[PDB]
Design an enzyme around this catalytic site. Structure first.
Site, mmCIF file in Angstrom:
data_model
loop_
_atom_site.group_PDB
_atom_site.id
_atom_site.type_symbol
_atom_site.label_atom_id
_atom_site.label_comp_id
_atom_site.label_asym_id
_atom_site.label_seq_id
_atom_site.Cartn_x
_atom_site.Cartn_y
_atom_site.Cartn_z
ATOM 1 C CG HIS A 160 -4.878 1.144 2.885
ATOM 2 N ND1 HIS A 160 -5.790 2.033 2.382
ATOM 3 C CD2 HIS A 160 -4.199 0.669 1.812
ATOM 4 C CE1 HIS A 160 -5.698 2.062 1.072
ATOM 5 N NE2 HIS A 160 -4.739 1.247 0.697
ATOM 6 C CB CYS A 169 -1.040 0.074 1.137
ATOM 7 S SG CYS A 169 -0.357 0.209 2.847
#
Length: 320
Positions: A79, A10
């Site tokens: 994230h 990510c």
């Protein structure tokens, strides 16, 4: 697809539009020169940005080179993404202009995503060995003159001599005679099994001694090794402060604080303890390796003088 077969990158994702402001387009091969991309682990986009800024342009984030608030690097649900937040980055053209007098081809480098070789002033294709240190950074201590390939250090004796009854070993397994030892690792035999790149789990209890038995590979330079270890100091060593009894101890493998993040992280850890020192036991073979020693955990307000640990690191690494 440069992110094929990767589940935990990510951060590398989120970096694409930030890096694009400096003309940079990372290939898969080029991404593989970042350790955590290659091993597919959770990381800080910000630390990685600083790493890439140095490798490409020979400068770290304190140069202001990426200080334009163009693209956000944000965290939602653990994230990284580019969702709106007051944490924004991008090539700062005013800063580029200021730097161009000293570095004439730097504007072209940042226009075309090329390496500015701080050594030649000339442009290269990406190679992580060209710019090993940020030229703008005054290093707080000396780095090692030579690095060699030793076996891993055995710290069992050192830890067994520390004051305290209950020990948590984080990372690689360690036998500690005369104490109780819990073991936090991503292995089936661990007391607490978890992915260490996600940090010490909140549900881990409190201990007298936490030993962070985690190493980072040397590839190119002491600087590189140090900055690659920085995320582990944040995720393990710093989180370990939440898992200590009053007056407890945290000891951590480290490589000094050559980079800006390591320095910041160590400073923030050090302030939570009555004593903080660095040492290098006889059992510590790898030349860049040291143990950070944090004794007497409390929640007292306290300033930290970084010159104390820096002086010690300089001594250790220069034989002074």
């Amino acid at each position: 697809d440069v992110f094929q077969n990767k589940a935990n990158v990510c951060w590398a994702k989120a970096l694409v539009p930030v890096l694009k402001t400096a003309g940079i387009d990372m290939t898969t091969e080029q991404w593989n020169t970042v350790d955590y991309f290659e091993t597919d682990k959770a990381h800080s986009a910000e630390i990685v940005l600083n790493q890439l800024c140095v490798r490409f342009f020979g400068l770290d984030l304190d140069s202001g080179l990426f200080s334009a608030p163009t693209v956000p690097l944000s965290i939602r649900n653990n994230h990284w993404d580019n969702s709106p937040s007051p944490n924004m980055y991008g090539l700062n053209k005013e800063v580029v202009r200021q730097l161009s007098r000293r570095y004439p081809q730097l504007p072209r480098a940042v226009a075309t995503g090329r390496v500015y070789d701080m050594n030649t002033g000339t442009l290269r294709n990406y190679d992580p060995r060209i710019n090993l240190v940020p030229v703008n950074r005054r290093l707080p201590h000396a780095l090692v003159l030579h690095h060699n390939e030793h076996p891993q250090s055995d710290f069992s004796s050192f830890v067994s001599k520390l004051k305290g009854r209950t020990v948590l070993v984080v990372g690689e397994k360690l036998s500690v005679p005369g104490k109780m030892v819990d073991w936090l690792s991503d292995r089936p035999e661990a007391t607490f099994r978890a992915r260490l790149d996600l940090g010490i789990p909140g549900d881990v209890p409190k201990y007298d001694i936490i030993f962070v038995n985690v190493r980072t590979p040397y590839k190119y330079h002491h600087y590189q090794q140090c900055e690659d270890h920085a995320i582990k100091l944040s995720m393990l060593t710093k989180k370990a402060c939440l898992h200590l009894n009053p007056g407890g101890t945290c000891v951590s493998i480290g490589y000094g604080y050559a980079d800006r993040a390591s320095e910041s992280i160590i400073g923030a850890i050090a302030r939570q303890f009555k004593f903080s020192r660095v040492c290098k036991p006889k059992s510590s073979l790898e030349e860049t390796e040291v143990l950070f020693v944090f004794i007497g955990y409390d929640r007292k307000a306290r300033t930290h003088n970084p010159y104390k640990l820096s002086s010690t690191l300089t001594n250790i690494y220069t034989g002074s």
